[PDB]
Design a protein around this nucleic acid. Structure first.
Ligand code: MG
Ligand code: MG
Ligand code: MG
Ligand code: MN
Ligand code: MN
Ligand code: MN
Ligand code: ZN
Ligand code: ZN
Lengths: 827, 827
RNA sequence: CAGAGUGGCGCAGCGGAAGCGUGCGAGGUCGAUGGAUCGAAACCAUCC
RNA sequence: UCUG
């Protein structure tokens, strides 16, 4: 058998001794020549179908040789093209000959998915009748034929005869429906056994037909087989067994076997029995019939394995993320932008952390990076763990180099040398390359070299020059495949990519939403939790600036909460104020007004809606913009909000697509919204909560949601500290974490407890919700975090005065978490 | 030579005598065998590339014979598939052998454009270096190669040498970049000259390479050619001339020629000059290099012609109604819906006219139609005229039969037997079939039979059974291709299809528009001329009833003009009234109000807008719907309309896509809207007319715009009557025509004047705009025709009392025509 | 435009099979691959 | 691969 070599960062199949050179291979005997050719072609097919690799063969002479015409032609047949260089490149050194094989297909969703076949095969074992000849279907023909099958005569006169005259002439020729065969003179039963697989499947795959055995096909003479040579019952039994032995694959019901009529008739010479002639009528088969199992190979674990018939048909007829595939170019430009003329280290925060914790690491890396002038060096605590592989103690970090005029290199940094370091690095590089091809959908020639570096005080293959990243196009394509690969795993870079995907989804929804600016002066925006209400408000204030050409301070933003007010003020896109400040001060200078979280306003301090109406109507350019954003699921009090009735809240816009939270958080939000609908708060007008989220909408961004109950306050705080420490060690910054509590009164108690639990984790700095721009964890109440978001949120003991409002507080908490949400309910 | 036979309704190529049968073809000399094969393959390639046809060949034997293995294999090579039955079917009758060829690709926009090449070829003449061998690209390979090009070494150490030593061993083998040749005799010059065309193009197309002439293949020793056989100057001249003789095609700029380096180096023997060795370095070429012209054939005019290199590359790399292509299925189910279980005649009005005009036509057709149980028979005055061919006097009618278990048949009915009737029918059927394939994109096996019928009391070819319409799928696909074909011509059916296309575009825009119903209670809809405003209003009322579940009489429609009132009222979708009636009467039972053409309202009778506000505000579902449709380009007076200010007209919806007029009418409306914008009326709001048509929007519907000036009134009347008579002869109805005049005072004059002409055309029935549902020509004023539309409009002498109102009239007139507009201005 | 590639060397076969002349019983799978044929070096195609 |  063929076995993949284990100590390489690629798929490497050793095919042993092979005779190379056209003269050398012509001097061989055909049997050994064909055996060597078949070995090489099985290896090539497996590598084509398994993501690419290297074929290693020892050559018997030192001097450079040509591969050979038969091997060339077999590779051409394998890829159905004369463009060998697109998939095969050879190098040779000393007594070694290498064939570097590119993947035939890459990714779960190729562009050519409906155009080209998924596999390469040495043979498909599919035959069809083409006029008077039987022709094997190549990979493309078999693909089309299986697609067709999957989508939902004077010969009969002779067939009806119960006997034939020796030397009789049949009145028709061979055709699409008729075949004439003579009997072999030597081995009659072996001959029929050989003949049935060639012709019966071909007729079955195309309209059926007649097979006459014992007929000269040049004369159409009936000859048959001498009775001394054949026994009709044995012949019939052999024929039937051969026909029933043929593999068949059904795309339908019922799955009845091949339908055929077999007649053995007497051949009478001068009216007396001379011999027997065989006639088979093959009726058209509903689906594909194979002469035998297809000759297609693939790499499974560490072995080169042939595909079964049904597995082959499944591949030929049939955690990935569609959002990554859709946005790969934008995501790559955002995170992995490749600069001109200098080498970039990312993530910068993790790089700075690593060089601070480890002495000489910066010098080691900078020394190793001297040869490379342009590219990106992507760091990580453990690329192995990033790819769902086992962590290795002693590995300081891993770095992936993607630089111009170089192949991808995975670096593993060790504090001190270890025996398993090289094996660990090779395993990680192999996994990364296979992911880049099979999950990331990279269609080029790719290799990842595994190099182990040490801090304290098998040989790599030389790949062809086509495996070095030539320039910007190659680097960007490889980095987009890397984006797709990373989005399928849990890691720091994966979470950053998920944040950017959520931002892109919000941008799409905002592009749709902003068309309402030209069409409404007053507008009531009813957004659902996680629908991006506040992002929409900020972007619409920006757009108002450019559309009405008014100076930024002419636009006013009103909200209920000081933390949200401060967050909006930090961007300088407008003037931001709280309901109380808005009602107290004077704003005749304001043209346009945007009100957010209007469901949380209150009437005691005045008629804010009337004041906003007056201010916007007294504008110079007609009645100014007055857009009121609100979300009735996120009501924080049972009092009157001061909004107009639901009948008078027109014109209306609905933000129903969740674009701000990962998939688990969005599902939790939907369930909580349904619970709210079942038990609505009585201050909300009856018909408000009948807004339903988009039925088939999903974010395609993976996140985290854990509910940890029955814990004490001390246990909760210890768990929070441990999780935060793990995130920070992996490379998350503190400013991506928020701890939200039941009420503002418990904030100080839980703050002291969190500091007690965190002083063990080397960080002692917390922040209030009013300082979102600081590099610290924010601890506050769910109420005071309205409109603000963090990647990681810890929800501690969500509870309120009215059990009816507890689902509301759960929604308000869950909607603040973008990717990771930890809830610690009461017990 | 090969010429298509003229007597047939298909492309028929006569290839003459051909030897058929494998045993008979083996007896031939190779020269004759190959000549016959080449002739048959030229015919097959031409038919594949020209929409299909029949190859006729006379065979030398009476009895049936198989085609022959070489012919089978050539056909398989031509279609790059063993599925011969998909494109070729054979029949033989006595001494004639027929090959029925299907089109390779159909239509200007095939669904597989990016996958398969548009042409079949005998050879592409494109060669690539494939390791150590040169291979020609098949059609698919060349398609991919030209698609790629269309986008905007130790060998060098031996090449750089000034001289070589006899017996020197080259240290490299033949490879992707190196080719060795060794000619040892006289004729060395001819050998290298004919070596150039096969190796230089391959290297040029495949990244360049080296050609060493004078190197032993097996040992790689430099031997060269004895001095006495080679003259270096002459050799260089031949090599350069051969290289520059190679055809090249450029997709780029600059179109620089092929770049190469040629060296004739001295081969020394112990320091003594022995001979010459020739070395060529071929650099990669920007584009495709051909060894010769491609071998591809096509039928143009009556000849089978070979494509030139440039035409072949164009066809391999590069009226057609795209709207028809998009909507073919809906258009077919609308106009050519095939019924189950009976034969349908269309158009029904034209059929009735024909059988009323001609005695015995009904029995003739019904007796001819007995064999057919299911299908459709499509009548016309002249299908030849419909297909832009010449009209033939004596043809009563043409009918296209599309029935199950039959081939398409075009019937030509003559009043009396004629000699040229069969030629006319055959030409029409040939044109129809060729259009169905090359313009309607029909990818099945299609033939149109041509039968001539006589009202007064070359043999046809028998097609394979696969050309008969098996059932619903084939008949519907053929009728959809017919829809596409008809939409590219002028005819009654083409106009009906264009009307349905306009309706489908309006329906798409209404689906986009109706989403505003949930979001708005008050809405001001600002439509441009031809934007479907009234259709939107009607459909929105229909949706209001369905969504609010209120009875139709609860919805009120208010307009300015009695004819539009009547037209809307007859729909029974609502209560419809005029402005004055609305002010006068009581409407407390009304929930919703829709107001159309609001810019034409007047303030004299009262505050209609205030009344509508009051009525709608007090509905059960809160404030009721109050949608006000209006178009300021279509104003009818200089007086105040009573609408609220433009700033107060919010929220707004703008209908900017023209969906109710054909392309010429839409372009005319766009041109005149600029004239309006140049000088708007003083009563019109300042900024309202700043709305613009959708930039890249086109209906894709053919229409007619004719402006006939410098004519007197009787000339106008005669032209109108003549055009109406021509339309009615072709089969149009009088209810498709409107004659619009400047004012109602001139209506009485023009009505008598128009009758004075129509009494010569045998129509004496006219009506005003209030009888739009009758079977008569409508004559009325342009303003009185507000909100209504007809397929054919004659606009006569537009006029007004003030130049300030003059600009609107031409738009207000042109917007009322759907497909045909005739304007008769002053002069 | 055609032809040739079978014992070290030169060569005949022309549908059932490995032989002749030279060189000394030995010496080749009839240039390679694929195809038709019940069946080949022999018929067909492509390639070197 | 070579030859006429
Ligand atoms: Mg013989
Ligand atoms: Mg052979
Ligand atoms: Mg066989
Ligand atoms: Mn046969
Ligand atoms: Mn070679
Ligand atoms: Mn060579
Ligand atoms: Zn089946
Ligand atoms: Zn070029």
């Amino acid at each position: 058998p063929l076995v993949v070599e284990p100590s390489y960062p690629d798929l490497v199949i050793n095919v042993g001794e092979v005779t190379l050179g056209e003269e050398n291979r012509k001097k061989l005997q055909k049997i050994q020549r064909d055996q060597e050719k078949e070995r090489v072609m099985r290896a090539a097919c497996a590598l084509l179908n398994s993501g690419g690799g290297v074929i290693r063969m020892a050559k018997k002479v030192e001097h450079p040789v040509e591969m050979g015409l038969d091997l060339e032609q077999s590779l051409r047949e394998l890829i159905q093209s004369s463009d060998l260089q697109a998939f095969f490149e050879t190098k040779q050194q000393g007594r070694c000959f290498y064939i570097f094989v590119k993947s035939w297909s890459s990714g779960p969703f190729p562009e050519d998915r409906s155009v080209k076949p998924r596999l390469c095969s040495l043979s498909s074992s599919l035959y069809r009748r083409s006029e008077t000849s039987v022709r094997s279907m190549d990979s493309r023909e078999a693909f089309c034929f299986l697609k067709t099958k999957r989508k939902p005569d004077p010969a009969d006169l002779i067939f009806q005869k119960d006997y034939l005259e020796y030397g009789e002439i049949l009145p028709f020729p061979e055709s699409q429906l008729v075949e004439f065969k003579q009997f072999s003179t030597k081995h009659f039963q072996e001959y029929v056994k050989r003949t049935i697989p060639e012709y019966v499947p071909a007729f079955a795959n195309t309209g059926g037909g007649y097979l006459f055995i014992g007929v000269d096909d040049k004369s159409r003479e009936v000859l048959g087989c001498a009775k001394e040579n054949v026994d009709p019952d044995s012949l019939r039994r052999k024929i039937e067994q051969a026909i029933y032995k043929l593999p068949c694959v059904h795309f339908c019901q019922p799955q009845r076997p091949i339908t055929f009529t077999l007649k053995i008739v007497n051949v009478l010479k001068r009216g007396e029995l001379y011999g027997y002639a065989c006639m088979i009528r093959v009726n058209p088969f509903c689906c594909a019939v194979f002469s035998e199992a297809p000759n297609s190979w693939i790499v499974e674990d560490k072995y080169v394995c042939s595909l079964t018939t049904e597995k082959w048909v499944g591949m030929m007829t049939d955690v990935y993320s569609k959002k990554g595939l859709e946005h790969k170019k934008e995501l790559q430009q955002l995170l992995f932008s490749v600069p001109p003329g200098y080498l970039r280290y990312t993530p910068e925060s993790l790089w700075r952390d690593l060089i601070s914790e480890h002495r000489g690491l910066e010098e080691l890396i900078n020394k190793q990076m001297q040869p490379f002038f342009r590219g990106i060096l992507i760091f990580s605590r453990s690329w192995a763990v990033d790819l769902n592989l086992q962590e290795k103690p002693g590995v300081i970090c891993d770095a992936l180099l993607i630089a111009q005029n170089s192949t991808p290199i995975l670096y593993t940094i060790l504090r001190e040398q270890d025996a398993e370091g090289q094996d660990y690095c090779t395993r990680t590089a192999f996994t990364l390359k296979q992911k880049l091809v099979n999950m990331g959908g990279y269609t080029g020639k790719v290799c990842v070299r595994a190099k182990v570096l040490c801090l304290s005080p098998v040989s790599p293959m030389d790949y062809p020059a086509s495996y070095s990243l030539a320039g910007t196009q190659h680097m960007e394509a490889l980095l987009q495949s890397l984006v797709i690969v990373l989005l399928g795993f849990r890691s720091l870079l994966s979470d950053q990519l998920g944040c950017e995907v959520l931002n892109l989804l919000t941008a799409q929804q905002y592009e749709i939403f902003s068309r309402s600016l030209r069409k409404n002066r007053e507008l009531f925006v009813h957004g659902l939790p996680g629908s991006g209400k506040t992002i929409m408000a900020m972007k619409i204030m920006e757009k108002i600036r450019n559309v009405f050409h008014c100076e930024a301070h002419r636009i006013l933003y009103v909200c209920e909460n000081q933390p949200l007010r401060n967050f909006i003020s930090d961007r300088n896109i407008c003037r931001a104020e709280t309901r109380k400040t808005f009602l107290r001060e004077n704003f005749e200078h304001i043209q346009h007004i945007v009100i957010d979280e209007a469901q949380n306003f209150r009437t005691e301090d005045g008629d804010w809606y009337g004041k906003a109406k007056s201010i916007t109507r007294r504008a110079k350019g007609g009645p100014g913009i007055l857009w009121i954003f609100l979300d009735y699921f996120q009501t924080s009090h049972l009092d009157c909000s001061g909004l107009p009735p639901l009948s008078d809240q027109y014109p209306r816009e609905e933000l129903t697509r969740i674009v701000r939270n990962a998939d688990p958080i969005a599902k939790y939000l939907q369930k909580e919204m349904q619970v709210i609908r079942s038990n609505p708060s009585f201050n909300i007008p009856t018909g408000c909560l009948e807004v339903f989220p988009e039925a088939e909408w999903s974010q395609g961004v993976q996140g985290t949601l854990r509910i940890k109950k029955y814990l004490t306050v001390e246990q909760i705080m210890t768990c929070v500290a441990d999780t935060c420490r793990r995130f920070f060690d992996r490379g998350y910054s503190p400013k991506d974490v928020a701890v939200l509590v039941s009420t503002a009164k418990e904030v100080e108690h839980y703050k002291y407890e969190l500091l007690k639990a965190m002083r063990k984790k080397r960080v002692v700095q917390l922040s209030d919700a009013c300082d979102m721009l600081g590099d610290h964890i924010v601890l506050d109440s769910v109420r005071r975090f309205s409109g603000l978001e963090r990647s990681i949120v810890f929800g501690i003991h969500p509870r309120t005065a009215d059990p009816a409002i507890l689902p509301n507080v759960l929604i308000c908490l869950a909607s603040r978490a973008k990717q990771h949400l930890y809830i610690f309910p009461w017990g």
